[PDB]
UniProtKB/Swiss-Prot annotation:
Record note on what altering residue 78 to N does: Strongly reduced affinity for histone H3
GO MF, one example: histone H3Q5ser reader activity
Identification of the protein by name: WD repeat-containing protein 5
Organism, scientific name: Homo sapiens
Effect recorded for residue 293 to A: Strongly reduced affinity for histone H3. No effect on interaction with KMT2A
Recorded family membership: Belongs to the WD repeat WDR5/wds family.
UniProt keyword Chaperone, yes or no: no
Record gene name: WDR5
């Protein structure tokens, strides 16, 4: 129908501290979760079946991300490293060293030959996956970097920071193409490209999501009604059924908006702490949500629409 009817299907228990990030594998088979407990867990996407724990970081993990072929993970840790993992073997292939403070956010490019990282050290780093070498250090921001993301052809990087800026970077040169949001405040807590790479979805810590036209540098849509003043809460484009925007909230709910109309079309109740991370399954109408340390669970929700 015109509205989704997401209902709780599974609750995934096992993390012993706050969950930080959940991501579906591109092939749809797996959910990966990262946590302040220093662990990555892999779960069945469709039945929530616990598969394995992946360990090696010396401190908490803020983010995890999948290679395009679903074979590798990269994790971002308070131990100042990223780690590249073979999902099949659970083994650490590379440790990426160079950030001088917590690594907060990470992503592969579509090619999955590069990793982009953002740190509390106010830099964005670009890494070679094959060698684990740092190729470029961008002096991107003047406060912690909250999010980094490649566009669909890999030619662009978008970054966000507590400095209140969203910047777009030329991957090849590392040179800044655009400062898309230029305010002293509020902090920009999350950014990502739209699937078609024309738009940027940006969260600010004034309880606001905004869809920006990258080329024109203009705000096309605003999404409000949720609570976001403190945490770097992920947001998603839901594209498998109706065209939604999805975000967690500091009132312990998952919010779903109609992308075009900006109306709230569902609020998902069940979590007992801040919903820090949501993910949308690549082929099925399935959302994964994850909560901070009062809850420490992941929930899988399914919709007919
Ligand atoms: O959001 C925070 C930072 C914070 C800590 C303490 C107080 C206020 C803020 N931590 C939660 C875990 C990490 C969540 C996360 N990782 C990557 C993203 C978006 O790219 N979001």
């Amino acid at each position: 129908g015109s509205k989704p009817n997401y209902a709780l299907k599974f609750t995934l228990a096992g993390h012993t501290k706050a969950v930080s990030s959940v991501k579906f594998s591109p092939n749809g088979e797996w959910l990966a979760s990262s946590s302040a407990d220093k662990l990555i867990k892999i779960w069945g996407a469709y039945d929530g079946k616990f598969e394995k724990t992946i360990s090696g970081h010396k401190l908490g993990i803020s983010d995890v991300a999948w290679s395009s072929d679903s074979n590798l993970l990269v994790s971002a840790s308070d131990d100042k490293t990223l780690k590249i993992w073979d999902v099949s073997s659970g083994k650490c292939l590379k440790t990426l060293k160079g950030h001088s403070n917590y690594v907060f956010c990470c992503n592969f490019n579509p090619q999955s030959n590069l990793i982009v990282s953002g740190s509390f050290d106010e830099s964005v780093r670009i890494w070679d996956v094959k060698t684990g070498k740092c190729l470029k250090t961008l002096p991107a921001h003047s406060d912690p970097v909250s999010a980094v993301h490649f566009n669909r052809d890999g030619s662009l990087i978008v970054s966000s920071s507590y400095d209140g800026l969203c910047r777009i970077w030329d991957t090849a040169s590392g040179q800044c193409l655009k400062t898309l949001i230029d305010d002293d405040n509020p902090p920009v807590s999350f950014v990502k490209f739209s699937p078609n790479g024309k738009y940027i979805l940006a969260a600010t810590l004034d309880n606001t999501l905004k869809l920006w036209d990258y080329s024109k540098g203009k705000c096309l849509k605003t999404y409000t009604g949720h609570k976001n003043e403190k945490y770097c809460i992920f947001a998603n484009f839901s594209v498998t059924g109706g065209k939604w925007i999805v975000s967690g909230s500091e009132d312990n709910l998952v919010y779903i908006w109609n992308l075009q109309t900006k109306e709230i079309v569902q609020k998902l109740q069940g979590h007992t702490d801040v919903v820090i991370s949501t993910a949308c399954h690549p082929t099925e109408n399935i959302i994964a949500s994850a909560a901070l340390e009062n809850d420490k669970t992941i929930k899988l929700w399914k919709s007919d629409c």
